[PDB]
Amino acid sequence: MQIFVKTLTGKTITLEVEPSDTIENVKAKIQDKEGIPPDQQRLIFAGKQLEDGRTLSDYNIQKESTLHLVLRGGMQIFVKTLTGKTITLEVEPSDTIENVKAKIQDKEGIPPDQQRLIFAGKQLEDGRTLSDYNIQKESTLHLVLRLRGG
Amino acid sequence: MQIFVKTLTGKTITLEVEPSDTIENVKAKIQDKEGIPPDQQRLIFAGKQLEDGRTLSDYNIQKESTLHLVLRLRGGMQIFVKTLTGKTITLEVEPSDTIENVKAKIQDKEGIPPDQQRLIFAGKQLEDGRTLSDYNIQKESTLHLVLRLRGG
Amino acid sequence: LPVKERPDAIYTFEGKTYENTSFSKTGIPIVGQPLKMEAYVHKEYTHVTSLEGKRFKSQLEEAAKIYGEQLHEIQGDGNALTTAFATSFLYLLNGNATLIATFDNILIGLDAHKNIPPVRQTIEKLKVKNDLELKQILASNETMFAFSSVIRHLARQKLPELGEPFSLLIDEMVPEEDGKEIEIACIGGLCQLLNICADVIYLRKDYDTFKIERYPNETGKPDLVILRKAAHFLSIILDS
Amino acid sequence: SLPVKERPDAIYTFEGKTYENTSFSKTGIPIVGQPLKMEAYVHKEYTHVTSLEGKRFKSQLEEAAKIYGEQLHEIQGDGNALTTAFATSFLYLLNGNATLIATFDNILIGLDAHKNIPPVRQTIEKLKVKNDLELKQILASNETMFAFSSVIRHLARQKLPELGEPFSLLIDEMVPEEDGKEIEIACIGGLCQLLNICADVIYLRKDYDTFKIERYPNETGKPDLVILRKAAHFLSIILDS
């Protein structure tokens, strides 16, 4: 199916997609053609937001359908690497540690299962939330890579 | 971890793997280094066969472990898949293999995803969840492959 | 279908107005003008970064290396398979009186269809090789839509006569309703009926190289070259 | 311990045929291999490469050689490859560097008793004057390099906690005491901090077309060591000047 996407600047573009393509994959195609990074993309269709996990078929998107890029209150935190590199993330108090490691992956290319996160001298568990650790605005987390070998 | 693999000819090979790697992924590494197609590979470790879906950690495989490539079981059924153009594809299957598993083998030889394949036998389209025995597909039987790849 | 989903619809979302577009408003023709492949790649993959896009880009450039430097874009109205076929078929009909007569004889035998008369009038204009008339034919959205719908109707009526698999899967493979996608096997059947050869270029996102589906025999010189870019079809202008 | 059929060198029967597990001692793989051109290593490991993971590793290996050096040392995967690859790259830097030998020797004197400390000290003393031939003999001695590797592990466990977090908190998980237990990459960063040297660790990534360089202790600086991570295994790149 061939769909339409209208950018924030009003430009209209066509995309050759398939019903099974996920929304995350759509944003990747928008970047390949127009250059907008996926982290800046917020897509809507018929007045409903699209999450990276669904597919076009779920939102009954078909040929000639039009998706609109729109502007997005997120909490800013920092993740410092062993060498002192500072990573800036946008998070919510309900986000789990696994979600934060997924955000680190999108910026550093490191799989979540290869990351350790430390806050207040404590290692953070993947299933718990940021609120469980009292991680607030401007808090700084520490990233230590695993990547073990022998 | 660094493991050993011994081919049917006795040659010994090393592989740099990780505990989470699957057996299918190991066979892919064996092909990259030695060239044996994964469909010919039957791996054992400590006298136990290895299934394509499990991982090395499951078989408590670690550093210095040795995997052996062994001959396939006798008595397995050979079937043929003929495309719309007349090309003949040859597969090794068991009566318990599902139609989905057969399409996965077709993918490994033709590079076409299973969800883009139709299989027909006795003028009837075959369902993914049923087995070859459920359709009375015997040794040397011929199935027909019709590609989907729809577009508009 | 719901109002908010329809083309050209206007709605509001979080205090801002949005207007869905359409093929008629964007002016995208049924069959685009001749376009060099390198220009098409720059249009679709100017900022390519994803693995799927890099593979499509390199496979598109390899296809042009083999078959021809130019192509026709095809509107994704759901009939792109028959529209791309008609485009490639018209290049073959240009100046080929014997093939035009064989095609006209098939059209006469088909059940009634509103677009059959205009298609017959069109192929009459190509008995003598005329590149300029072909250009005007391909530039007419109404002419090419008629051609595209006639190929669909033709496939549904004649392919079942070839036997299996077409007798068993015709409705799933070539739906009657306009705008419903068609399976690739339809091209293979059409080549068999018309006694021509086609190469279909299956762009694969899971592999570094494309896959060539050649009909009716895995050997032979192609008369048509159709490219499948996801669930969409384009027509390559075959160079000699 | 572990079942008989799983042990190295074990012989068992499977479907009417006999099979013999191998081992590092039977295959003769040295602790540290001889200098090997990268193109020769790639030909060994990826001569029939077809998978996406292997083609990425192959292209990332060839780019690594373009940047850092044409030759490398293979390292035995006995579970100590991180400290063995570190020792290999470190010995190239110690060759002819009397100042660094003294700094390293001073750390060794302070470490808790260990049988392999005396031989390591005698070895580095033989490198105060640049001697490529002695270095070649050192790296070719399985006994010497195993001793060198185990001393680095012992050294890391004793001294890295003194750097503070994260090492004080994760030392046992990051650098196990038992020989043959894999070590996490942060151990290299700590060692560079203690020894006041710079290292580039080349993380070969199967999910990306390019590798990722982990540089310690600062994301800027000229590397003295170049260590390559190929899956859960480490090799040592011979640094060209």
Automatic annotation (TrEMBL), chain B:
Keywords, sorted A to Z: ADP-ribosylation, Cytoplasm, Isopeptide bond, Membrane, Mitochondrion, Mitochondrion outer membrane, Nucleus, Ubl conjugation
Membrane topology label: Peripheral membrane protein
Ubiquitin-like domain: residues covered: 1-76, 77-152
Classification via PROSITE patterns: UBIQUITIN_1, UBIQUITIN_2
Gene: UBB
Keyword Signal set for record: no
InterPro entries per the UniProt record, alphabetical: Ubiquitin-like_dom (IPR000626), Ubiquitin-like_domsf (IPR029071), Ubiquitin_CS (IPR019954), Ubiquitin_dom (IPR019956), Ubiquitin_ubiquitin-like (IPR050158)
GO cellular component, one term: mitochondrial outer membrane
Subcellular localization, as worded in the UniProt entry: Cytoplasm; Mitochondrion outer membrane; Nucleus
Xref: PANTHER family: UBIQUITIN
Main location: cytoplasm
The name this protein goes by in its record: Ubiquitin B
Family to which this protein belongs: Belongs to the ubiquitin family.
